[PDB]
């Protein structure tokens, strides 16, 4: 399972994360009850690059991957992310594909 996103240099990028399709094991009845954390890193690396970071208020709340693309990180980027359920101990490896490209239109001085 992979998903391709299209970030651009200059503005923020944020990814809301839902355990419904991110996790290979479906959460039936009320899905908001189950607490799941997420650990995202560069493929073959322990941590995200400087421009990108990750936060989570509570395990019973969705996490957030967010950051501003840099002109020095332009091109193809690979994110290996693991959905660590705080309860179910279920590993859900996932790949995200990022294409950092130049912004289109007038700049914002």
């Amino acid at each position: 399972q992979q998903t391709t996103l299209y970030p651009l240099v200059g503005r923020v990028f944020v990814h809301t994360l839902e355990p419904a399709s991110f996790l290979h094991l479906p959460e039936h009845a009320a899905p908001a009850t189950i607490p799941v954390t997420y650990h995202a890193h560069l493929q073959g690396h322990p941590d995200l690059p400087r421009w990108l970071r990750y936060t989570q208020r509570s395990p019973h709340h969705p996490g957030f991957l967010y950051g501003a693309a840099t002109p020095e990180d332009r091109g193809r980027q690979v994110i290996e992310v693991t959905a660590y359920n705080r309860d179910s101990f279920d590993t859900a490896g996932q790949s995200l594909v990022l294409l950092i490209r130049d912004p289109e239109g007038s700049p914002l001085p």
Partner: protein
Amino acid sequence: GKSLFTVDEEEVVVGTDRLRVTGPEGALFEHSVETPLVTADPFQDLRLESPTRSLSMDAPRGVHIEAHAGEVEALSQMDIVLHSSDGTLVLDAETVCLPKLLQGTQAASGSSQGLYEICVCPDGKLYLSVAGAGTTCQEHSHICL
């Protein structure tokens, strides 16, 4: 002709399998470190100190602390929580020592309610029965199966 150590304007290639830095100051790894193994030189202790913050040990498949020829020492200045959420707790030892229990005085009068006694199922399951003048474990053998 096997390369062993090379430098250039591009990188610094080390073709060997070890890189020892003898400086007494040590390393400074500005973020997390990926490895399948951490150890020390033979006949040398290893301390994992957290001198100013807390520490965690997390494994989705499980953690197995081993001292096959030694002992596990676990003293804490505060409360210790053996929090099995909904699972079991098997305690496999020849001897269990509980020298720091509060001493109770048997009397006909009851200080309050909620008093119980500890009862053992034949398979090792532990439960409680209502405290009385005599034993009540034998009267409450429904849970044992």
